Each structure stands twice: as structure tokens, then as C-alpha cells.
Design an enzyme around this catalytic site. Structure first.
Site, PDB file in Angstrom:
ATOM      1  N   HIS A 125      16.517   1.863  24.228  1.00  0.00           N
ATOM      2  CA  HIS A 125      15.714   1.975  23.008  1.00  0.00           C
ATOM      3  C   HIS A 125      14.229   1.803  23.299  1.00  0.00           C
ATOM      4  O   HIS A 125      13.830   0.880  24.015  1.00  0.00           O
ATOM      5  CB  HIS A 125      16.158   0.940  21.964  1.00  0.00           C
ATOM      6  CG  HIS A 125      17.580   1.096  21.520  1.00  0.00           C
ATOM      7  ND1 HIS A 125      17.996   2.122  20.696  1.00  0.00           N
ATOM      8  CD2 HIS A 125      18.687   0.369  21.800  1.00  0.00           C
ATOM      9  CE1 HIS A 125      19.297   2.020  20.491  1.00  0.00           C
ATOM     10  NE2 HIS A 125      19.740   0.965  21.149  1.00  0.00           N
TER      11      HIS A 125
ATOM     12  N   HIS B 286      15.206  -7.762  29.865  1.00  0.00           N
ATOM     13  CA  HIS B 286      16.339  -8.330  30.593  1.00  0.00           C
ATOM     14  C   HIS B 286      15.932  -8.847  31.960  1.00  0.00           C
ATOM     15  O   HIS B 286      15.090  -8.254  32.628  1.00  0.00           O
ATOM     16  CB  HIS B 286      17.428  -7.271  30.785  1.00  0.00           C
ATOM     17  CG  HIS B 286      17.973  -6.715  29.508  1.00  0.00           C
ATOM     18  ND1 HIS B 286      17.474  -5.574  28.920  1.00  0.00           N
ATOM     19  CD2 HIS B 286      18.987  -7.135  28.716  1.00  0.00           C
ATOM     20  CE1 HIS B 286      18.158  -5.315  27.820  1.00  0.00           C
ATOM     21  NE2 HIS B 286      19.082  -6.247  27.674  1.00  0.00           N
TER      22      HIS B 286
ATOM     23  N   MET C 288      24.726  -9.715  29.385  1.00  0.00           N
ATOM     24  CA  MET C 288      23.599  -9.954  30.285  1.00  0.00           C
ATOM     25  C   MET C 288      22.289 -10.333  29.576  1.00  0.00           C
ATOM     26  O   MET C 288      21.196 -10.150  30.132  1.00  0.00           O
ATOM     27  CB  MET C 288      23.356  -8.699  31.140  1.00  0.00           C
ATOM     28  CG  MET C 288      24.556  -8.221  31.976  1.00  0.00           C
ATOM     29  SD  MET C 288      24.288  -6.592  32.765  1.00  0.00           S
ATOM     30  CE  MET C 288      25.939  -6.262  33.397  1.00  0.00           C
ATOM     31  N   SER C 289      22.386 -10.874  28.368  1.00  0.00           N
ATOM     32  CA  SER C 289      21.177 -11.245  27.640  1.00  0.00           C
ATOM     33  C   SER C 289      21.432 -12.267  26.523  1.00  0.00           C
ATOM     34  O   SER C 289      22.404 -13.013  26.562  1.00  0.00           O
ATOM     35  CB  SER C 289      20.546  -9.985  27.043  1.00  0.00           C
ATOM     36  OG  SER C 289      21.397  -9.409  26.064  1.00  0.00           O
TER      37      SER C 289
ATOM     38  N   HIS D 117      28.252   2.503  31.425  1.00  0.00           N
ATOM     39  CA  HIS D 117      27.553   2.360  30.153  1.00  0.00           C
ATOM     40  C   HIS D 117      27.825   3.404  29.071  1.00  0.00           C
ATOM     41  O   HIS D 117      26.976   3.636  28.204  1.00  0.00           O
ATOM     42  CB  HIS D 117      26.046   2.179  30.375  1.00  0.00           C
ATOM     43  CG  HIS D 117      25.501   0.904  29.799  1.00  0.00           C
ATOM     44  ND1 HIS D 117      25.935  -0.343  30.199  1.00  0.00           N
ATOM     45  CD2 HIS D 117      24.554   0.685  28.856  1.00  0.00           C
ATOM     46  CE1 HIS D 117      25.282  -1.275  29.527  1.00  0.00           C
ATOM     47  NE2 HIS D 117      24.437  -0.676  28.705  1.00  0.00           N
TER      48      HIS D 117
ATOM     49  N   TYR E 292      17.657  -8.748  34.724  1.00  0.00           N
ATOM     50  CA  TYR E 292      17.982  -7.766  35.752  1.00  0.00           C
ATOM     51  C   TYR E 292      16.906  -6.704  35.942  1.00  0.00           C
ATOM     52  O   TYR E 292      16.939  -5.965  36.917  1.00  0.00           O
ATOM     53  CB  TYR E 292      19.352  -7.113  35.493  1.00  0.00           C
ATOM     54  CG  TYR E 292      19.480  -6.302  34.214  1.00  0.00           C
ATOM     55  CD1 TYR E 292      18.742  -5.133  34.022  1.00  0.00           C
ATOM     56  CD2 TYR E 292      20.353  -6.701  33.207  1.00  0.00           C
ATOM     57  CE1 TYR E 292      18.870  -4.381  32.860  1.00  0.00           C
ATOM     58  CE2 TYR E 292      20.486  -5.967  32.050  1.00  0.00           C
ATOM     59  CZ  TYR E 292      19.745  -4.812  31.877  1.00  0.00           C
ATOM     60  OH  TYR E 292      19.859  -4.103  30.703  1.00  0.00           O
ATOM     61  N   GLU E 293      15.963  -6.615  35.002  1.00  0.00           N
ATOM     62  CA  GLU E 293      14.881  -5.635  35.097  1.00  0.00           C
ATOM     63  C   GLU E 293      13.757  -6.163  35.989  1.00  0.00           C
ATOM     64  O   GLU E 293      12.906  -5.404  36.452  1.00  0.00           O
ATOM     65  CB  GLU E 293      14.319  -5.305  33.716  1.00  0.00           C
ATOM     66  CG  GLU E 293      15.341  -4.810  32.719  1.00  0.00           C
ATOM     67  CD  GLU E 293      14.707  -4.303  31.439  1.00  0.00           C
ATOM     68  OE1 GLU E 293      14.112  -5.112  30.692  1.00  0.00           O
ATOM     69  OE2 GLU E 293      14.802  -3.083  31.182  1.00  0.00           O
TER      70      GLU E 293
ATOM     71  N   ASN F 234      33.685  -2.744  24.947  1.00  0.00           N
ATOM     72  CA  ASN F 234      34.737  -2.420  25.904  1.00  0.00           C
ATOM     73  C   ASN F 234      35.652  -3.592  26.216  1.00  0.00           C
ATOM     74  O   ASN F 234      35.248  -4.749  26.138  1.00  0.00           O
ATOM     75  CB  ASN F 234      34.120  -1.915  27.212  1.00  0.00           C
ATOM     76  CG  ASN F 234      33.270  -2.973  27.903  1.00  0.00           C
ATOM     77  OD1 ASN F 234      33.685  -3.565  28.901  1.00  0.00           O
ATOM     78  ND2 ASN F 234      32.074  -3.214  27.374  1.00  0.00           N
TER      79      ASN F 234
ATOM     80  N   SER G 168      21.702  -2.783  21.738  1.00  0.00           N
ATOM     81  CA  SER G 168      22.553  -1.584  21.761  1.00  0.00           C
ATOM     82  C   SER G 168      22.805  -0.829  20.438  1.00  0.00           C
ATOM     83  O   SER G 168      21.963  -0.028  20.000  1.00  0.00           O
ATOM     84  CB  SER G 168      23.887  -1.894  22.459  1.00  0.00           C
ATOM     85  OG  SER G 168      23.679  -2.288  23.808  1.00  0.00           O
TER      86      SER G 168
ATOM     87  N   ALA H 157      25.685  -6.222  22.943  1.00  0.00           N
ATOM     88  CA  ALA H 157      26.926  -5.489  23.192  1.00  0.00           C
ATOM     89  C   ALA H 157      27.556  -6.286  24.331  1.00  0.00           C
ATOM     90  O   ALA H 157      26.854  -6.706  25.250  1.00  0.00           O
ATOM     91  CB  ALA H 157      26.629  -4.066  23.631  1.00  0.00           C
TER      92      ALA H 157
END
Lengths: 289, 289, 289
Positions: B64, B86, B219-220, B257, B88-89, B243, B33, B116
Site C-alpha cells: 500500500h 516493518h 511480522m508486525s 503472499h 524486515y525492511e 492462511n 493488508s 494479516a
């Protein structure tokens, strides 16, 4: 998932064994770590390498040479798996538990499972024998389950209960038998939690597992208990506390598989004598009863 | 699972890079991030798109442009991944962590990971930099692990420990360096918990994660730390609190996001200066030491 | 994972339905266990077997014959799935949630989900109706998620929030409506936790789930809510407490699917009248409003 094994495959494998040994086991024992020397007390023993048995998952597990041994242990006819399959090796749950269903087809009625586990409960010491009273199946929370996919009615029901998985009568007998052995240390009892592995837990993870009520942590056995209970097998097991997990960031060291020596040598001997004594308490058949 | 990548594939990829750049990095940085602008302070920089490097997982991640950059940052030769892969990808853990093993083959000895994360710890504020001291690998509880399958002895052992994954000496140096920067806010430190994603957590899930002792959720990163520690890499990382998660059903809003701006702009700048300063504290090579 | 269904497949299936029925549903209802008789109150009903609808996952679930029914319920045009798909059957999350995306393409704006669940909350009794206020998606912790893989922009965003998944206004209306029915028992409300199944939980697992804040445990619904919220559907659901889980090792019995009778008969009737009344409170279209 869609288990590659059809009912017939289990039957073919069971039929093959029946045609190669006159032995007809009533009890099946899955040896984990220390209990690997149990095969030495079996009389009239016959060995089969997992490689020569059709449909059997062949393995290259670091610990014990994959072989199934039939024989008589303390007047009881049984079959033991000298070495088990693990998810961390690449095997899905339907592969790891294949032998459990074959045992049922051979006419086995009781399954005894053993393993080596890290002690989470502060009252445990290395060398402690913990009677598994219950379990927490973490992989099962995410749908990783040996029963996943279409149910084979010939083995059991669609939604089997697990609350009574660990035979109460056997846990009662195990306690009596331990007393007769004159052990200085008490026979522990508790809930075992399974993780995927193969890396060892972090301090944060161990504190979490302990808060959830787990007494010992391991990387196997649970899928075998689920399948065993699904097909009607009476089940009871033991964890050999091979190490006391570190719950502090000020770690005096880290984990490693030196457990082969630790407990695997000292506590394993007692564990063998223990399972040998229990063979006489298992109900019906085998012996002259 | 049976990782599609053989040892040779890692070596072929490492050999390709060595034949295209004179750079020989000692440190590897995975940017998450905010730190995406770090590539701008690298001198003698050479860029490679993930698409031109054989065997490299190509990606279409929203954030990125996938490129690996070699260069000198504050007197230290390093290589950074501008953009990560990731789960989730759609990528399994063996795909996401492929670059980590290549770094080891290039001779890299230290891996710095950033990300992040949502702040669970009530004492955190948006913009806070949290030194990752430990982690909770939830996917690992169900057997989702980059080390799943047959172990490659050439990289590490079968059962690697994770209790000391985050290099203590570096966390010590990071604290000293933060003091020299004259920051008004303290440098936070805590345990990071990883979830699969890509949806954001519910209030119930956040309260659960917090009770388990987690300070930040993401998530990573975790799979990368496991593989890095498995092959011998010294590891240390940072989470940018983008956040503060809502723990009340009387939600004043919901997650999204927008964090690309929030923290990704303000706190990211400091995060860059921070990592640049740390390059001088990493032990041996690179600089004139 | 890479969902085998492309956007076009959803559209083809939606286009097929539109060309076979004049019905244009505004609300979609997924029936779980007890509510299976709801189809009987639909007027101008038209039935489709899941087997005749192209691209639709065909199922052999033990409980209700797989059929989608269109019709008018209390002045509202709706479509209901008489029988759902489950992960424990072998279906991955992208298969189980396929109908949810088709509903969106048919122009549906509200999704009502029901299920049968074990009551963890000590204050619950068999027959209790629990308004689902939140959920804990355990399979999602390990990356098992229907949104896993490349995002289809045409349905929603990459990182959708789940904190507001259960429509507050509907939960408000459900409470008012329950009062008008003159029920002796209060309308419960709480968080539902999903597990993979198909075996029932152990005592240890139930105590764990309860500590995590869960009020009821089930093996479905959650993936459907995630996908529904991802494509913009307003969502609200109900759990029928079919049984009170045993949290003591001194178990007076074990679990089994007798729940088809228990609650499925007595509490289901009220549950039907309940959902029928709610059709008039759902905002816009359908009725003369």
C-alpha cells in the site's frame, strides 16, 4: 560485536584502582535492588563514583547511585558495585560486563550476583530468596552475547561451557548457612530467565516462560555470569522474589516497580545478613584462612 | 537503542500536521493488508504522503502506498496510516513506531491496529477475524524493543506493564457488534505472536509457535502496541487470518503472499464494515458524545 | 540490515573467479568441522585463499584455513569452502552468507551444507550422521536474518517460504546410498536448531531446546540455507553428532571443543566417503548426465 574495550583498557582501569586504594578485594559483589544497603556493613570502606574511574561505563539508572565500594565485610575484603548497567538502558553487553573483567584483573576470584525477579514458580511467595541454580539466556539465543566478536585469549577460551556456571559448593554452603539463621521459610533454588525489558511481561509471556522451566524472570545478571565464568571466576547468585507474576487474564492488577518497597525493604534486610554470613564460607584468603 | 528522534522531533511533526489540516482525530487506525480500502469510507478526507511530512519514515513497502489519511468514519474523526513500516525492511523499532508517538501528540486517545496473520490455531479458517487478546513479543526476548535506551519521561514510565495492553472494554464491544452484523462465523479471539521475517516459517517453527500458545503468527504490530501503551493510548486490534499454516512435513504446498487476494478481498470487506461499526462504540469525543 | 554488498559486488567477485579458473562448478559444498579433509579427494583441484578473492570475507576461524577449492569429486565439478564464517566471530548474517550468492552467480545449482552439532535427541550417539530434515532459526525470531533490509529482486522474492528448504529427493537418495555403504548404524534424520554462541549450552537450555522438538544444536548453517533457498539453490545437509549433551544437573563433566578429535576423526572419514558417493546422485550436469 567488536568490543570497543581492548585488553589494555581493562588493565588501565584495574591499574588506576590499585593506585588509589590499599584495598585488595578477593570477592566482588554486584548489588541488585534490595541489597543496595549492603554497603553499610563494610568496614574500612572506600567509595569511588563510576564517573571518576576511567573507562568505566557511567550510568543514570533509576535505583542506586553508581558507585564502587571497597571494604571488609565479615572479615572478607571485597568490592561491590552499588548499581549495575542494563541492556534496556542502551548499553550493549560488552559495556554492561566491563567491570567483571576489571575485577578479575584486580585479583578477584569469586563473584556474587544478586537481583530482584518476578516469581514464576507457583510455590514462591513475595520475599522469597531463590538461590540461582541455572539460567536461560534468551538474548543469547539471537546472538546477543557479551562474548560476541573476536575472543581475547588472555581472558578465556573461544567456546566456554556454561553448564557448571553456578558453583555447587557455594550453593551447598548457602543452604547450611540459611539453616543456621533459623529462617521459617525455606531457601528456594531454581533457574532464572533473562528478558531484555524494560516493559513487564504479559500473561501469555509469563505462561510461556514458566513452561520452559523458568522459576523467576529478570532483566539482568546473565551476561555478567557468562563473562565471569569465561575469565575463571567462581560464581553464585540470589534472586529476591519481589513479586508474584499474574498468569490469568482475569488480572486483579498489573505490574509496576513498587518492588523497591515490597521485598526491597522487608526481605532485603535478611538478604544482607545472609550475604554477610556467607563471606566466611567462601574459600581461601580474605579472612585468616 | 539511542532513538535518533528527540521529543522535539515528535512535536515538530505533530505541529506540522496541525497547521495543514483542520481535522483533529480522536482515534488512529493502522491498516494492515486487507483493511487498506478502509480509506474509501472516510468523509472530509485529507491525504498526506509520508514523503511530505517532515521526520516521517518514508517507505517503499510492497502493498500500500504510504499515506496518512484524516477524515470522518461513521461520525468519528480519525487518522489512518495506509501502510506501515516493518523491521524486515531494515527499520529499527524506533523508526517503525514513530507515528504512534505523533498520534499521541495530536491528541489521539485510541489506537486500532490490524494485520494479516497465519492461523496456527487448528480451529481457525482462512477469512477468520481474530480479536487480538494478547501477544508474544519474540524480538523483545532478545532485547529488540522500541523502548530500548533512555526513557522519555514525557511519554511514559521506565517499566510499563503489558498484561492489560488489549483494552478489555473494546473486546467486549467488538463481540456485541459482531453479533449485530449477523455473521455466520464466530468472532475468534486469541494471542498473536510476532517474528522478524521476511521469510515464512518452516513446519518445525510453526509447531513450536503453536505449542507456546500462539494462535496466529505475524511480522508486525507488537512494537506499535508497546509504544502505544507506553504513552497512554487505549489499544485494540484484529488479525485477518489470510492462511492456514501447514504443520505437516507431507506439505501439500508452501506459503506465498497470494494472501493479498485470499482474505484480502473476501474477508477484508467485512473487516472494513466491522471497524466502521466500532467507531460508534469507542468512548468520548468524535461523535456527539 | 542494509547489506553493505550491492548486487554488483557479488557479480564482481563471481567474474573474478571465472577469470582465474577454467572450472565451472555445478555443486557447492560448505565444510563444517570433520568434512574438512574432503578437499583431498578432489581431482584437478585449484585453491584460492579467501584473502585473495576481492569482496570475500577474510576470516581467522579456529579450525580450518580459509580457502575455496574447485575440483572434481566423483565425476562432479564442485566448489567447496574449507571453513565458514560465524556470527559469534563478529560477522553479521549478510557477511556470513556472501559466498552463497556468489555460488549462484557462478552457475551453481545445488548447495550441500555440513556441520558438527550436539545431539539432543536421546537416541543419538557420538559419531551419528543426522540428515537435516528441518531447522529452527532462533536468531531469526528476533529479527536477526541475512535477508533483513531491502530485497534484491534479482536474487529472489520478499517473503520466501522455508518449509521445503531441505530437498526431499536428496534426502531420499541419501538414505538409499547409506544402505549401499553397508553401515551398521542407521542414518539419522531430524531438525537442527541454531543458537548464537560461542559458549556452550547449560542443562536448562538443552532441556528447553529438546522440548521445542530440536534433535541437534549448532551455531551455524541456518543463515546459509535461508539465502540459498532465497536465490533458488537446491539444499541438503548433514550434522555430525560430535557430542551427547548433558541434560542432568549431576553432570559427569562439561562441554569443550575436543570434538575436533571425537567424531572429527572417526565419523568424519565415513562422512567424506558419504558425500563423495552422493555426488553421483545429484541431478543433471557435472558427470556424463
Amino acid at each position: 560485536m567488536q568490543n570497543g574495550y581492548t585488553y589494555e583498557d581493562y588493565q588501565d582501569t584495574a591499574k588506576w584502582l590499585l593506585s588509589h586504594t590499599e584495598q585488595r578485594p578477593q570477592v566482588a559483589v554486584i548489588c541488585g535492588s534490595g541489597l543496595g544497603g549492603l554497603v553499610n556493613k563494610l568496614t574500612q570502606a572506600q567509595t569511588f563514583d563510576y564517573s571518576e574511574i576511567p573507562n568505566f561505563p557511567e550510568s543514570t539508572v533509576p535505583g542506586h547511585a553508581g558507585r564502587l565500594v571497597f571494604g571488609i565485610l565479615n572479615g572478607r575484603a571485597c568490592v561491590m558495585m552499588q548499581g549495575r548497567f542494563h541492556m534496556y538502558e542502551g548499553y550493549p553487553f560488552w559495556k554492561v560486563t566491563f567491570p567483571v573483567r576489571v575485577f578479575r584483573l584486580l585479583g578477584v576470584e569469586t563473584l556474587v550476583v544478586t537481583n530482584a525477579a518476578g516469581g514464576l514458580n507457583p510455590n514462591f511467595e513475595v520475599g522469597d530468596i531463590m538461590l540461582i541454580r541455572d539460567h536461560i539466556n534468551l538474548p543469547g539465543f539471537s546472538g546477543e552475547n557479551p562474548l560476541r566478536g573476536p575472543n581475547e585469549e588472555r581472558f578465556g577460551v573461544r567456546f566456554p561451557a556454561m553448564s557448571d556456571a553456578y558453583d555447587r559448593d557455594m550453593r551447598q554452603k548457602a543452604h547450611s548457612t540459611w539453616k543456621q539463621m533459623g529462617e521459617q521459610r525455606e531457601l528456594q533454588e531454581g533457574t532464572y530467565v533473562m528478558l531484555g525489558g524494560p516493559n513487564f511481561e504479559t500473561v501469555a509471556e509469563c505462561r510461556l516462560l514458566r513452561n520452559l522451566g523458568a522459576d523467576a524472570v529478570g532483566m539482568s545478571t546473565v551476561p555478567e555470569v557468562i563473562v565471569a565464568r569465561h575469565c575463571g571466576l567462581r560464581v553464585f547468585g540470589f534472586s529476591l522474589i519481589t513479586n508474584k507474576v499474574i498468569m490469568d487474564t482475569e488480572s486483579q492488577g498489573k505490574a509496576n516497580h513498587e518492588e523497591v518497597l515490597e521485598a526491597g525493604k522487608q526481605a532485603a534486610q535478611k538478604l544482607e545478613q545472609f550475604v554477610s554470613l556467607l563471606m566466611a564460607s567462601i574459600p581461601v584468603s580474605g579472612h585468616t584462612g
